[PDB]
Amino acid sequence: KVFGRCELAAAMKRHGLDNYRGYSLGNWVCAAKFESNFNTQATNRNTDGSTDYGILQINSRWWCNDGRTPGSRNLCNIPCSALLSSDITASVNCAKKIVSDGNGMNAWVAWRNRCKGTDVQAWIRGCRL
């Protein structure tokens, strides 16, 4: 499923991401835009044998099990396929654990490269939240 910008914003707000750990909703919507372009089916295979899954591109090396990543840990206790569903609950709960893993939102390289330091409030424009 491909979310509309405000549609995703509402969904995330609904799952408690707005201001979570001090990160405004805009940051989260912006991360999603550049990590997967709001596509819940998005996947990216890395060169280290791992793969990023879903709307927030969560990595299989440590956060989920896809049964084909060497020395992989499943800290979120879920199959990576669950991060490719139209319901973002799984991705959000797992994201909540990653953003609290000691690096803030820097865990998402796309967020770091395209959202960090910018006027992320714009990503929420026109939304009736």
What are the residue numbers of the active site?
Answer: 35, 52
48 appears as a binding residue in the annotation: no
CA distance 31 to 24: 11
Strand partners, 59: 52
Q: b or e along 74-91 (b: 16 or more beta carbons within 10 Å of the residue's beta carbon)?
A: bebebbbebbbeeebebb
Strand partners, 105: none
- In order of their start, the domains of the chain are 1-129 (1.10.530.10)
